[PDB]
Every structure is written in structure tokens, then in C-alpha cells.
Amino acid sequence: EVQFKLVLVGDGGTGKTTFVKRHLTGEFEKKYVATLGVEVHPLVFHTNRGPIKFNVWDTAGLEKFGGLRDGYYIQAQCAIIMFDVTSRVTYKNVPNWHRDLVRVCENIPIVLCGNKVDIKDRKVKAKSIVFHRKKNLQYYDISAKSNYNFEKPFLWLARKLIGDPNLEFVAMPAAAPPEVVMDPALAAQYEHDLEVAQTTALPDEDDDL
């Protein structure tokens, strides 16, 4: 297992924390709770070349919650720059995030990600997105909500950091799960907990799943 420091940067509400949380737990957080300074989470993928661990430094996009700002970028080995394709200002700000990042990290693989491509009224058109070309950034359209291309930023960075272009995500063998006996002392405990959960609606009942 090798570990790499990954810095995630971009304007407030572009979907940085939502994207990371989806990768960590599988969940989709609908609410906007602005990151304060930085949130650090280990994230592990299983590849045909063994496990790879990203130490993910999810930084604050809002100026008032910026904390150490470029202080977070020190010794980063890779980066994602995030914008919102429903918000033109967030793409206008991509050169500013890139500037602040590369002044600290001169020679690292960087992915530019246009998030929220699931939303019908797209404001930053494909034709407009060219900033990555002269800066040698990889670019992906992503949706943390629909999971469109949600694995690509990490698959591309893993290939760059391992120096293997043929690297793939793989399924690890699944251990036989334990047989257990329901605890007769916690049986009344569980009918309660199940009552609450049966009578709370599942989210997004209109989706394909």
C-alpha cells in the first residue's frame, strides 16, 4: 500500500465534500454544509497493482472559511480542481485556484472536474471549457449525484502516481460473512429501530434506482 496526498480545490458549493463523501461512504449528501478550513479523509482503491491510498485534503472554497488556504497545498502529490457547470463564476475562478495551487505544487498531476452535469440547465458549455489544454490538466464532466464519471478523476491520478497506464480498479475477494444468533435481550430494541426506519421515506423515489 502506497499513500499520496491529494488536494481538492474550487469555489464554495461546487461539490468537493459531496464528491469525497460519495467515494468514502457511498452516500449522497443533499445539504450544503460549507467546509471550515480543510477536512482530511483517507480513501483507498483496490487496483490490479495492489491497493492505493489517497490522503484527501478537502479544502474550503468560501473565502471567509478559507483557513490556511495555500498552506493546505504543501507536499500535495496530486490535485482535483472542481467547478460547477451550472455556475459560470465557478469556471471563471478555475484559473485563480490553479494559480494558487501550482505556485506551491509545481509538477503534480491535476484533474479539472466540471460537476453537476446531471442538472438539465447547464451554464458552462463544453465549447467554453479549454483552460486545461495549455495547463496539461486532465478534464472530466462528473456528477457526484448521478455518479457520471465519478471514478475517473481517481483512476487517472492512480495511473499517473503509480506510472502504469494500464492500471484498473478491481474487486477484492469477499470473505465469507459470519452466521450469528439475534440477541434475545435486544429483540424489543430492534422492533423499535425498525418501526422508525419503515416510517421514514427513502429519498429520491423518482430515480431509476
Binding site: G37, V40, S87, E106, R133
Partner: protein, 996 residues
């Protein structure tokens, strides 16, 4: 213990800071997290800057010193001008001294690049503040200190690179226009001496790290310096030969030559043209001899991803496309330059084969430029024949599906141009690729799909005769392919592609009725195939063919007994029997397209009658049972049937618009009774089961009925031609059925689709129903506002539809707002300002537009009491609310419309277009002009909101603003200058005198 550094009453323990920082950067979990919070509180302490010089002197952690410089940078950029001159000179000296010291120690220079670069940026922040007016000798001393040491010279190149970026590349948003111009003129005035130094280092050579830093600074200079520094020195030769040969300098040099290719250059000068040719010749010669020949497999190289190969090949693509899009005409008329021209294009052909979507798009943009040129420019296509032949194959093998709209558009346009240039070569490549599908050598689902999309994309480029032969050959071959293939997966893939191709050649279908009939009847057969994707592609192909060939379905074709639309309708039950509801609706939508071609009213109404036969008979029986027994609606199966009848009506109304009226008229009464009956059931369910009821499948089903009814009425009214019938037949029953139901439901049961329907009604017939618009406001205004005025998040759909409704009422029926009681009108002004404060761009933009339109609505009323009372009550609320969202840095997307609103408000007073005093009496002399009072009010408001500004800054700003209130671009300039100045202390009040 870590929290010790936050205690400022005691001197700072550097060894503790160093541990906190180490904990943050190298620690984990709970410890990392806590160190993080402590460091942020330390940095944000407004006296923390005092500790910087101590930390820089006595810390052993380079991360501590980095964070110290961040703290210093906050002071320099925000509060520098508060410092006595002696203190500013002190800070300047301890920064310069730290930089020189670090550079003179070879070990530290090698290993502490982070801290040196951060120090260099800090120095540049001081230069932005101090230079040149309070530091005239900076550049001479930098040039002087550069000969003392290779490390200092190299670091000086990093400083000049960052200075150039800060002054020319990033100044627009970060400085006043006046300050940006001052620093640009200042660097321009001293550049001669900077360039001399850069050229000497490049000529004298030796240290690769120094040369690379120097070319990195040159890349920045090329954004702004005059061409003569490049064309009237040896630098073009050095860049295009020496620096292309060594791989350390090759990547930066290529980037420089790309920017050289974009210089502003004289057009009528043969020596400059020859120099432009020569640097290209030299660069391509160095690549062919030192990197790879023209024949090299760049697809393979890129895939292998060795070292910096990917970045180099991207940079080569950028250089070739940039240079050729500007200069290829220089290479086209001279026989001696033919080989250079075709080798450069041959490199682009090889780069275009790289498996990398974003690189492909870059090269495709160039190819589009070129083939568009060859289509129009005389005597040029013959040059590029072999390049274009290769490119035909690259585009055909790379064709994406039409769902990827921008990429498919680009690819189609290139392939269309190429097909015009050589139809025979395009045909030969497509037929031979089809042959390799049939012989199995290149067979795969992706490969037959790709080819089908390419064949589809050139429809309409060939002559009708050539198209005919081509289409027949392709369908014959794809049919052979289908038969040949085994198992349903393979057969489905080829069947879908046959359908796809046929659907893209309407000109062929329109000439061959017998073939078109066969296609349709075959599509009807496929609508019974349950194999995944077949029914969807059959329905998609049907509606696509109808959109294009609808006229051929509505006439009687020779040797047919009736128009084919009659034949479709007659067998509709059987045709659609195996389809999912959404597929059935597409089928009926397609029949609607055809029927709308019939312009004989009697015949059209009869076709519509016959098409709607099955949903109308299903409806009639349900309505009989629904009226007979109200309990029957509760049944899940009935709700799904009713929803699907309404959806069928929406589908046919979508394609028939105004023509759909007789069908709407047939169901209208009982549809609105159903709306009321379903509404009762929802209310009843929510009472019995609680708010959770709204999540249940039953209540979602019932709400679906209401939403589809609202959708059907908005669909019809948005396209209606006879507005008299809309107002006289549809509107009264609609308003009676929906408005009171919306008002008297609990928030969670209210449909945002009601607001959307009402928006279309006011849009189309608002002028004709003044009492209806009043009733709409009374029913939806205050109850919807109360749902959305507690936070920015709840009821997002209601939020959006609410401001769209207010916007159209304010445009079309402003009298409805005059009829409001004063309390209700005050809530309307509250609602508009509330919209201003939103970050969802939909609401904010409607908010600011309503404000504009309302001002215009009031101004129209002329000198009357309502207008006079409006200004007295609300002028200052709008001015201050607009200033609030302009300045709080939380509403930057709204900048343009905020400025437009502020300009209109200020211009009303500057023009004396407000009849009464805006001040209440004995607040100023009773003679006082509104202009004097507005000036006073704004000076006071800005002074309290921004107490760090001087009286001089505020007065200068407001003087400029009122003078520029007829010139939006200049006004916006002044506003942006103000937004820069409020982020710092001691902004120059003369900045507001700026003129371009």
C-alpha cells in the same frame, strides 16, 4: 498544551508552534484536526503578523515559516498603508534578506523550494504596494545582484515571473484600473533592462535550472511585450534551435513559441514573414531529429506515458494548431515550403490518433478550421488531398453518438466538409470499413455503432443519385450482417444501427414511398420485441422519421386506399399492445405530428377524434364509475390508468398545439372535476396519515394526476392561437379548480406546477383577465412567500416558480400590484429584495429583473401620488439592498444586473425625475435637491458599513458613480474599483478619476 500559541499575553514558544504544525502536516485523525483549528485561529489573530519576524528567525520548521509568510501576506495586502514608513522598510529588508540568505546556501536553495517561492510571492506583494514610487532602485539592484550568484539570478527570474503574472495576468479583478495601469506602465518602463538580463542568461547558457526559470519568466513576458523584443534579437533562433534540442528546456520553449505565434505582428513585411517561417522550420527540424520522426506512432508513445511524453505531445498539438491556424498561408504558395507544411500536418494526423478525448478535441478544432478553409478558399484543397484522406479515416473511426452534442456536432461538420471535398474517398472508406464488419476482422458492437453514426452524419452531403446508390449499398450490407450474426444480442445491435441509418436519410425515404412503408411496418414489428432496447429504438426511429417525412403519411400515396395515418390509427391498439406507457406516449406524439400536417379542419378534427379513441373510451368508463362511486379512485391500478390517459393527452397536445383544442374541450369539464376529487383524496389522506402521506405511492400517484392536468393546460395555453376561447372557456373553470385548492392545502401538499401553469396563463392572456390576475395573486402570493422566506433552501421549486410568476405579473398586469393593500405591497418589495439575497442564480436574476421592471412600471405612471409615495417609501430600501448584495462578496454572479439597477436608481435622481423630496422635512434645508440628499445618504451609509474608508475615498467614489450613471461599462468599472478598495486600508481616492 498545543493551544498555548493562541495565548498572546505570553511570548510565543516557537518549539510548540513547530509541534502544532508537525501535528497538522504529519499527524492523523483527531490530533491533525485539533492542530488544524489552532493554526487557523493563530493565523487569523489580527496581531499575529507581529510574531512573523520572530518565527522566521527562530523556527526550524519550514512549514511554520510558510504559515508565517501567509500571515505577513494578509497584513501586506489588507493593512500595509497603516504602517509607519520605517516599519514597512523593516519588513521589506527582513524579506529580501531571508530570500538572499536562502539562495546563498546551496543546500537550502535545493531543498526549500516551497519556502523560497512563498518568500518571492511575499516580496511581489510588497512590490505591488511600494514599487516603483517608494522603491525606484528595485529593478537595478535585482539586475545587479543577478551577476553575484547563479542561485540569486535564478530566484530573481522567479520574482520577475510572479511580478509579471500579478501585474498583467491577474490584475483585472485584484487591483483598481488606476493601480493596474500604474504597475503595467512601471514594468513597461523598466522592461528594456529586464530583457537585456534575460537575453544574456539565455545566450551565456550553462545551468539548466537557471535557463528553465528564465524561459518560464519569458512565457509570462510574451503575454504583453512588443514583438520587436522577439523578432529584432537572436531570441527566435535560440528558442527554435538550441532550447528545442535539450529536453530540460524543450517543454517550456514549445510553450514560449506557441505564445510567440500569438504576438501582435505587422502584416505587410516580407522579412518578418520569412522569420515566422524560419522559427517553425527550425522547431519541426529539431523535433524530427531529436524527438521523433513524422512517421512515429504517437498513439503508442502517448499510451506508454513515459516521463513527460504526454505533456510534450499535448504542447506540440497546441503549438502546431496555434501556428498553422494563423500562418499556414505563409507555407502554401512556395514550392520550397510544401514539405514543411505537409510534415507539420502529418504530425497533427499522428497526434489525432492518440486515445485522449481532450487532446482529440484540440486537434479537431484545428481540422474544422482547415477543412472549412478548403471548402471556401480557392486553389487550396489539392495541397491537402493526402492529409484529408487520412483525416476521413481518423474522424470515421472516432465518431461519437449524437447524444454527446458538442463533440458529435464538431465531428459531423468536419466529416461533411471532407465529404464535399472528396465524396468518392469518403464512400470508399465507409464501404470498406463495413466490409471489415462483415468479414469479422473489425467486428464489435462499438465498431458497428461508430461506423453507423459516421454513415448517418454525412446525410445530405452527396447528390440525391449518389446518396440513393450509397444508402441501398449500406442497408443491403447491414441486412447481410444481421442475417449472418447469431443470437439476439448481436441481431439487436445491427437492427438498431439499420434503424439509426434509415432514420438519418429522410430525402431517400421521401423519394421511395414503398421503402418508407416497409420501414414503418418493420418498426411496428420491432415494437413487439421485448429484447432490451429494441422497443425504445423502434419508437425513437418512428418519431424521428415522422418529424422529417410527416407529409408522406397525410396524403394518399399512389396504389394506397387511404392516407397511411388512417392505417396507423386503425391498428394502433395492436401496434402499441406490448409497449411500456412512455413508449405508447411517444407513439401518440408521433401520430400528433402527422395529424397537424392536415390543414383541412374537418379532416384534422376527425383524425384527432380517431387517434384519441382508446384513451377517450378508457376515460369515459372511468368517469362513469368515478361519478357513480367516489371510492373507486383510491384503487392504485385506476390512478395509474388515469395518469397514463392524461400523459397521452399531454403527448398529443405537445405535437398538435393550437390544433389540440377540440380534444381538450372534450375532456375539460370532467378533467377539472377529477382535479377536485383527487385534491380531496390527498387532503383526506394527509389528515388521516400525517405529512408522511405525501411520500406514499398512493398520494404520489394522485399528485401525478394533478401535475399532468396542470401540464396539459399549460401545454395547450402556451401554443393556443384562439385566446378568446382560452379566456372565455378555459380560464374561469381552471382558476376555480386550482387556486383555492393551492391556498387551502398545507405547504407540503401544494404543487409548484400550479405556479408554473399560472405563469403561462398570465404570459399568454394576462392583459385580457385583470380580475383573474388579482385572484391568482390573492390565492398564491402571501402563502407561497411564507413557505420560502425562512431560509434559502426549503421548497426550491416553489421558490423558482414564485419569482417567475411575480416577474410575468409585473410585466403583463402591473395593475394587480396597484390593487394590493399597502401591507401586501410592502411584502411585494420584501419579496423582491429577498430574491436579491439568493445564491441560486435563477431566483437572484428574476429578483433583480422584477426590481428593474417595477422601477420602469412606476416611472411610466408619471407625476401621481402612487409613484411619489413609492419613491418616499422604497427608493432608499432598493438603493441600500442593491449596495448590500454588490459589496458583501456573496452575490458576485448578480454583478451586472445589480449595477444596471443601481445605475437606473441613481440616474432617476441625477435627472430630477422624482417629483417630491426623498427626505422627511427638517432633516435638511427645505430647498435641498434630491441629488444633494442622495449624496449625503450614500456617504453616511457607506461610512457606517465601511468605517475603514476615508471621507475622501467615499466622496470621490460617489462623485464618479453619479457622473457615470449613463455609461454602464464605466459605472461597472467604478463599482469594481470600490470592491477592490473596501478589501484594504488607504486606497487612493484619485483611482475613481480613471479614464481609458
Amino acid at each position: 498544551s498545543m493551544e498555548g500559541i493562541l495565548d498572546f499575553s505570553n511570548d510565543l514558544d516557537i518549539a510548540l508552534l513547530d509541534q502544532v504544525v508537525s501535528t497538522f502536516y504529519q499527524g492523523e485523525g483527531v490530533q491533525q484536526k485539533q492542530a488544524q483549528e489552532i493554526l487557523t485561529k493563530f493565523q487569523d489573530n489580527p496581531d499575529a503578523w507581529e510574531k512573523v519576524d520572530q518565527i522566521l528567525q527562530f523556527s526550524t520548521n519550514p512549514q511554520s515559516k510558510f504559515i508565517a509568510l501567509s500571515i505577513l501576506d494578509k497584513l501586506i495586502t489588507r493593512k500595509w498603508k497603516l504602517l509607519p514608513n520605517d516599519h514597512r522598510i523593516g519588513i521589506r529588508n527582513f524579506v529580501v534578506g531571508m530570500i538572499i540568505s536562502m539562495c546563498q546556501d546551496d543546500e537550502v536553495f535545493k531543498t526549500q523550494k516551497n519556502l523560497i517561492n512563498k518568500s518571492d510571492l511575499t516580496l511581489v506583494q510588497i512590490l505591488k504596494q511600494e514599487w516603483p514610487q517608494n522603491w525606484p532602485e528595485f529593478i537595478p539592484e535585482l539586475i545587479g545582484s543577478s551577476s553575484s550568484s547563479v542561485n540569486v539570478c535564478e530566484n530573481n527570474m522567479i520574482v520577475l515571473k510572479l511580478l509579471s503574472e500579478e501585474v498583467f495576468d491577474f490584475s483585472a479583478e485584484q487591483m483598481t484600473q488606476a493601480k493596474a495601469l500604474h504597475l503595467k506602465n512601471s514594468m513597461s518602463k523598466e522592461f528594456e533592462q529586464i530583457f537585456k538580463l534575460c537575453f544574456q542568461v539565455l545566450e551565456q547558457g550553462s545551468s539548466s535550472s537557471l535557463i528553465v526559470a528564465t524561459l518560464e519568466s519569458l512565457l509570462r513576458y510574451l503575454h504583453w511585450i512588443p514583438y520587436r523584443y522577439i523578432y529584432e534579437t537572436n531570441i527566435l533562433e535560440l528558442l527554435s534551435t538550441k532550447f528545442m534540442t535539450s529536453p530540460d528546456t524543450r517543454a517550456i520553449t514549445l510553450k514560449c513559441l506557441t505564445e510567440v505565434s500569438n504576438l501582435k505582428i505587422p502584416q505587410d513585411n516580407d522579412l518578418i514573414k520569412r522569420q515566422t517561417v524560419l522559427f517553425f522550420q527550425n522547431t519541426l527540424q529539431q523535433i524530427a531529429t531529436s524527438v521523433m520522426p513524422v512517421t512515429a506512432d504517437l498513439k503508442a508513445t502517448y499510451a506508454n506515458a513515459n516521463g513527460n511524453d504526454q505533456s510534450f505531445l499535448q504542447d506540440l498539438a497546441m503549438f502546431l494548431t496555434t501556428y498553422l491556424a494563423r500562418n499556414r498561408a505563409l507555407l502554401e504558395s512556395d514550392e520550397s515550403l510544401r514539405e514543411l507544411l505537409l510534415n507539420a500536418h502529418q504530425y497533427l494526423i499522428q497526434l489525432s490518433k492518440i486515445e485522449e478525448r481532450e487532446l482529440f478535441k484540440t486537434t479537431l478544432d484545428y481540422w474544422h478550421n482547415l477543412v472549412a478553409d478548403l471548402f471556401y478558399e480557392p486553389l487550396k484543397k489539392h495541397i491537402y488531398e493526402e492529409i484529408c484522406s487520412q483525416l476521413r479515416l481518423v474522424i470515421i473511426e472516432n465518431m461519437v453518438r449524437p447524444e454527446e452534442i458538442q463533440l458529435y456536432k464538431s465531428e459531423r461538420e468536419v466529416l461533411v466538409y471532407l465529404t464535399h471535398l472528396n465524396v468518392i474517398d469518403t464512400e470508399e472508406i465507409m464501404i470498406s470499413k463495413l466490409a471489415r464488419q462483415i468479414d469479422g476482422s473489425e467486428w464489435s458492437w462499438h465498431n458497428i455503432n461508430t461506423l453507423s453514426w459516421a454513415i448517418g452524419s454525412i446525410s445530405g452531403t452527396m447528390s440525391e443519385d449518389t446518396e440513393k446508390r450509397f444508402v441501398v449499398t449500406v442497408i443491403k450490407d447491414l441486412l447481410g450482417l444481421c442475417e449472418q450474426k447469431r443470437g439476439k444480442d448481436n441481431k439487436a445491435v445491427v437492427a438498431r444501427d439499420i434503424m439509426y441509418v434509415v432514420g438519418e436519410y429522410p430525402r431517400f425515404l421521401k423519394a421511395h414511398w414503398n421503402f418508407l412503408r416497409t420501414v414503418i411496418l418493420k418498426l411496428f414489428e420491432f415494437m413487439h420485441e421485448t429484447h432490451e432496447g429494441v422497443q425504445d429504438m423502434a419508437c425513437d426511429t418512428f418519431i424521428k422519421i415522422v418529424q422529417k417525412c410527416k407529409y408522406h403519411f397525410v396524403i394518399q400515396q399512389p396504389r394506397e386506399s387511404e392516407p397511411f395515418i388512417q392505417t396507423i390509427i386503425r391498428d394502433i391498439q395492436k401496434t402499441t399492445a406490448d409497449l411500456q406507457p412512455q413508449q405508447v406516449h411517444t407513439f401518440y406524439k408521433a401520430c400528433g405530428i402527422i395529424i397537424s400536417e392536415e390543414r383541412s379542419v374537418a379532416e384534422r378534427n376527425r383524425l384527432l377524434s380517431d387517434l384519441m379513441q382508446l384513451p377517450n373510451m378508457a376515460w369515459d368508463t372511468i368517469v362513469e364509475q368515478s361519478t357513480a362511486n367516489p371510492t373507486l379512485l383510491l384503487d392504485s391500478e385506476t390512478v395509474k390508468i388515469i395518469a397514463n390517459i392524461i400523459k397521452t393527452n399531454v403527448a398529443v397536445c405537445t405535437s398538435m398545439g393550437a390544433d389540440f383544442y377540440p380534444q381538450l374541450g372534450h375532456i375539460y369539464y370532467n378533467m377539472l372535476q377529477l382535479y377536485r376529487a383527487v385534491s380531496s383524496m390527498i387532503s383526506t389522506q394527509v389528515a388521516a396519515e400525517g405529512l408522511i402521506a405525501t411520500k406514499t405511492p398512493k398520494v404520489r400517484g394522485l399528485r401525478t394526476i394533478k401535475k399532468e392536468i396542470l401540464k396539459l393546460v399549460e401545454t395547450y395555453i402556451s401554443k393556443a392561437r384562439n385566446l378568446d376561447d382560452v379566456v372565455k372557456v378555459l380560464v374561469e373553470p381552471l382558476l376555480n379548480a386550482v387556486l383555492e385548492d393551492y391556498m387551502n392545502n398545507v405547504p407540503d401538499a401544494r404543487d409548484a406546477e400550479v405556479l408554473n401553469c399560472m405563469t403561462t396563463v398570465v404570459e399568454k392572456v394576462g392583459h385580457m383577465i385583470p380580475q383573474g390576475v388579482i385572484l391568482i395573486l390573492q390565492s398564491v402570493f402571501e402563502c407561497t412567500l411564507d413557505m420560502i422566506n425562512k431560509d434559502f433552501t426549503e421548497y426550491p421549486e416553489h421558490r423558482v416558480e414564485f419569482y417567475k410568476l411575480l416577474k410575468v405579473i409585473n410585466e403583463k398586469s402591473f395593475a394587480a400590484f396597484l390593487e394590493l393593500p399597502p401591507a401586501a405591497f410592502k411584502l411585494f418589495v420584501d419579496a423582491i429584495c429577498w430574491a436579491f439575497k439568493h445564491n441560486n442564480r435563477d431566483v437572484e436574476v428574476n429578483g433583480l429583473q422584477i426590481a428593474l421592471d417595477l422601477v420602469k412600471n412606476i416611472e411610466r405612471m408619471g407625476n401621481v401620488p402612487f409613484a411619489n409615495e413609492f419613491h418616499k417609501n422604497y427608493f432608499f430600501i432598493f438603493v441600500s439592498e442593491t449596495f448590500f448584495v454588490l459589496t458583501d462578496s456573496d452575490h458576485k454572479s448578480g454583478f451586472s444586473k445589480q449595477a444596471l439597477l443601481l445605475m437606473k436608481l441613481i440616474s432617476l435622481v441625477y435627472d430630477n425625475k422624482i417629483s417630491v423630496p426623498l427626505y422627511q422635512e427638517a432633516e435638511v434645508p427645505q430647498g435641498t435637491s434630491n441629488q444633494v440628499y442622495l449624496s449625503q445618504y450614500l456617504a453616511n451609509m457607506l461610512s457606517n458599513a465601511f468605517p475603514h474608508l476615508t471621507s475622501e475615498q467615499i466622496a470621490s467614489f460617489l462623485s464618479a458613480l453619479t457622473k457615470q450613471c449613463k455609461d454602464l461599462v464605466v459605472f461597472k468599472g467604478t463599482l469594481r474599483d470600490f470592491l477592490v478598495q473596501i478589501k484594504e486600508v488607504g486606497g487612493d481616492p484619485t483611482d475613481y478619476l480613471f479614464a481609458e
